Design a protein around this motif. Structure first.
Motif, PDB file in Angstrom:
ATOM      1  N   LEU B  11       0.901  -1.193   0.000  1.00  0.00           N
ATOM      2  CA  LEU B  11       0.000   0.000   0.000  1.00  0.00           C
ATOM      3  C   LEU B  11       0.918   1.215   0.000  1.00  0.00           C
ATOM      4  CD1 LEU B  11      -3.143  -0.506   2.168  1.00  0.00           C
ATOM      5  CD2 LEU B  11      -2.920   0.399  -0.136  1.00  0.00           C
ATOM      6  N   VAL B  12       2.082   1.043   0.564  1.00  0.00           N
ATOM      7  CA  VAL B  12       3.089   2.137   0.629  1.00  0.00           C
ATOM      8  C   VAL B  12       3.677   2.398  -0.768  1.00  0.00           C
ATOM      9  CG1 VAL B  12       5.508   2.415   1.293  1.00  0.00           C
ATOM     10  CG2 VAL B  12       3.765   2.012   3.031  1.00  0.00           C
ATOM     11  N   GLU B  13       4.460   1.485  -1.282  1.00  0.00           N
ATOM     12  CA  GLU B  13       5.057   1.688  -2.638  1.00  0.00           C
ATOM     13  C   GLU B  13       3.927   1.894  -3.640  1.00  0.00           C
ATOM     14  OE1 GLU B  13       6.317  -0.402  -5.986  1.00  0.00           O
ATOM     15  OE2 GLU B  13       5.887   1.709  -6.015  1.00  0.00           O
ATOM     16  N   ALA B  14       2.981   1.011  -3.629  1.00  0.00           N
ATOM     17  CA  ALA B  14       1.829   1.146  -4.557  1.00  0.00           C
ATOM     18  C   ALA B  14       1.246   2.542  -4.380  1.00  0.00           C
ATOM     19  CB  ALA B  14       0.765   0.092  -4.237  1.00  0.00           C
ATOM     20  N   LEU B  15       1.405   3.115  -3.214  1.00  0.00           N
ATOM     21  CA  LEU B  15       0.886   4.496  -2.997  1.00  0.00           C
ATOM     22  C   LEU B  15       1.692   5.427  -3.900  1.00  0.00           C
ATOM     23  CD1 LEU B  15      -0.532   4.716   0.319  1.00  0.00           C
ATOM     24  CD2 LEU B  15      -0.105   6.937  -0.644  1.00  0.00           C
ATOM     25  N   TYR B  16       2.978   5.247  -3.946  1.00  0.00           N
ATOM     26  CA  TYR B  16       3.799   6.106  -4.834  1.00  0.00           C
ATOM     27  C   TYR B  16       3.123   6.103  -6.210  1.00  0.00           C
ATOM     28  CZ  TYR B  16       6.589   5.177  -8.984  1.00  0.00           C
ATOM     29  OH  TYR B  16       7.023   5.064 -10.288  1.00  0.00           O
ATOM     30  N   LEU B  17       2.387   5.060  -6.497  1.00  0.00           N
ATOM     31  CA  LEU B  17       1.685   4.970  -7.810  1.00  0.00           C
ATOM     32  C   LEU B  17       0.253   5.510  -7.684  1.00  0.00           C
ATOM     33  CD1 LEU B  17       2.719   2.226 -10.108  1.00  0.00           C
ATOM     34  CD2 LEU B  17       0.472   3.259 -10.452  1.00  0.00           C
ATOM     35  N   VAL B  18      -0.317   5.450  -6.511  1.00  0.00           N
ATOM     36  CA  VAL B  18      -1.710   5.947  -6.328  1.00  0.00           C
ATOM     37  C   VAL B  18      -1.688   7.427  -5.953  1.00  0.00           C
ATOM     38  CG1 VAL B  18      -2.188   5.603  -3.847  1.00  0.00           C
ATOM     39  CG2 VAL B  18      -3.903   5.148  -5.480  1.00  0.00           C
ATOM     40  N   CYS B  19      -0.975   7.761  -4.932  1.00  0.00           N
ATOM     41  CA  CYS B  19      -0.874   9.177  -4.509  1.00  0.00           C
ATOM     42  C   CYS B  19       0.276   9.869  -5.244  1.00  0.00           C
ATOM     43  CB  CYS B  19      -0.616   9.250  -3.014  1.00  0.00           C
ATOM     44  SG  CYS B  19      -2.154   9.675  -2.164  1.00  0.00           S
ATOM     45  N   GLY B  20       1.494   9.484  -4.964  1.00  0.00           N
ATOM     46  CA  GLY B  20       2.651  10.136  -5.638  1.00  0.00           C
ATOM     47  C   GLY B  20       2.704  11.607  -5.223  1.00  0.00           C
ATOM     48  N   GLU B  21       2.293  11.905  -4.017  1.00  0.00           N
ATOM     49  CA  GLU B  21       2.308  13.321  -3.547  1.00  0.00           C
ATOM     50  C   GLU B  21       3.612  13.607  -2.796  1.00  0.00           C
ATOM     51  OE1 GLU B  21       0.850  15.617  -0.868  1.00  0.00           O
ATOM     52  OE2 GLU B  21       0.535  17.094  -2.403  1.00  0.00           O
ATOM     53  N   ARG B  22       4.703  13.681  -3.504  1.00  0.00           N
ATOM     54  CA  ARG B  22       6.015  13.972  -2.853  1.00  0.00           C
ATOM     55  C   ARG B  22       6.141  13.227  -1.516  1.00  0.00           C
ATOM     56  NH1 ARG B  22       4.854  18.463  -5.106  1.00  0.00           N
ATOM     57  NH2 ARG B  22       3.316  20.034  -4.584  1.00  0.00           N
ATOM     58  N   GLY B  23       5.561  12.063  -1.396  1.00  0.00           N
ATOM     59  CA  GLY B  23       5.691  11.309  -0.113  1.00  0.00           C
ATOM     60  C   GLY B  23       4.322  10.823   0.367  1.00  0.00           C
ATOM     61  N   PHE B  24       4.309   9.967   1.355  1.00  0.00           N
ATOM     62  CA  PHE B  24       3.015   9.443   1.883  1.00  0.00           C
ATOM     63  C   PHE B  24       3.234   8.833   3.267  1.00  0.00           C
ATOM     64  CE2 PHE B  24       4.857   7.367  -1.852  1.00  0.00           C
ATOM     65  CZ  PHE B  24       5.718   6.484  -1.187  1.00  0.00           C
ATOM     66  N   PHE B  25       2.173   8.492   3.950  1.00  0.00           N
ATOM     67  CA  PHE B  25       2.322   7.875   5.298  1.00  0.00           C
ATOM     68  C   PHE B  25       1.059   7.059   5.619  1.00  0.00           C
ATOM     69  CE2 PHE B  25       0.174   8.898   9.307  1.00  0.00           C
ATOM     70  CZ  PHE B  25      -0.887   9.675   8.824  1.00  0.00           C
ATOM     71  N   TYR B  26       1.167   5.756   5.619  1.00  0.00           N
ATOM     72  CA  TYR B  26      -0.026   4.909   5.919  1.00  0.00           C
ATOM     73  C   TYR B  26       0.160   4.237   7.287  1.00  0.00           C
ATOM     74  CZ  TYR B  26       1.087  -0.076   6.028  1.00  0.00           C
ATOM     75  OH  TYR B  26       1.506  -1.332   6.418  1.00  0.00           O
ATOM     76  N   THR B  27      -0.859   3.595   7.791  1.00  0.00           N
ATOM     77  CA  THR B  27      -0.736   2.930   9.118  1.00  0.00           C
ATOM     78  C   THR B  27      -0.248   1.492   8.933  1.00  0.00           C
ATOM     79  OG1 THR B  27      -2.925   1.922   9.214  1.00  0.00           O
ATOM     80  CG2 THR B  27      -2.765   4.285   9.684  1.00  0.00           C
ATOM     81  N   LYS B  28       0.782   1.112   9.638  1.00  0.00           N
ATOM     82  CA  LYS B  28       1.305  -0.278   9.511  1.00  0.00           C
ATOM     83  C   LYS B  28       1.240  -0.975  10.874  1.00  0.00           C
ATOM     84  CE  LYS B  28       5.929   1.251  10.544  1.00  0.00           C
ATOM     85  NZ  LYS B  28       7.346   0.846  10.321  1.00  0.00           N
ATOM     86  N   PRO B  29       1.107  -2.276  10.840  1.00  0.00           N
ATOM     87  CA  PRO B  29       1.029  -3.100  12.059  1.00  0.00           C
ATOM     88  C   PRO B  29       2.422  -3.293  12.667  1.00  0.00           C
ATOM     89  CG  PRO B  29       0.775  -4.495  10.042  1.00  0.00           C
ATOM     90  CD  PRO B  29       1.024  -3.046   9.582  1.00  0.00           C
ATOM     91  N   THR B  30       2.542  -3.136  13.956  1.00  0.00           N
ATOM     92  CA  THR B  30       3.870  -3.308  14.608  1.00  0.00           C
ATOM     93  C   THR B  30       4.904  -2.430  13.901  1.00  0.00           C
ATOM     94  OG1 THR B  30       3.166  -5.610  14.714  1.00  0.00           O
ATOM     95  CG2 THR B  30       5.348  -5.068  15.589  1.00  0.00           C
TER      96      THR B  30
END
Lengths: 21, 30
Positions: B11-30
């Motif tokens: 969801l993170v790297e794929a975000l670089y493809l979905v958002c691509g907004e000079r960076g991103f921050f999702y919630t991860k387990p542990t």
């Protein structure tokens, strides 16, 4: 909510479009 | 848009493809 099941990242990143900064 | 079970670094790297907004921050387990 989102995630916690199949880690999704497939048919819901249109939602992921709001995770970026 | 193929395979499943990604949320971690996918969801993170794929975000670089979905958002691509000079960076991103999702919630991860542990």
């Amino acid at each position: 909510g989102i995630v916690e099941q199949s880690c999704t990242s497939i048919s819901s990143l249109y939602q992921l479009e709001n995770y970026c900064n | 848009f193929v395979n499943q079970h990604l949320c971690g670094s996918d969801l993170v790297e794929a975000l670089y493809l979905v958002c691509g907004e000079r960076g991103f921050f999702y919630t991860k387990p542990t």
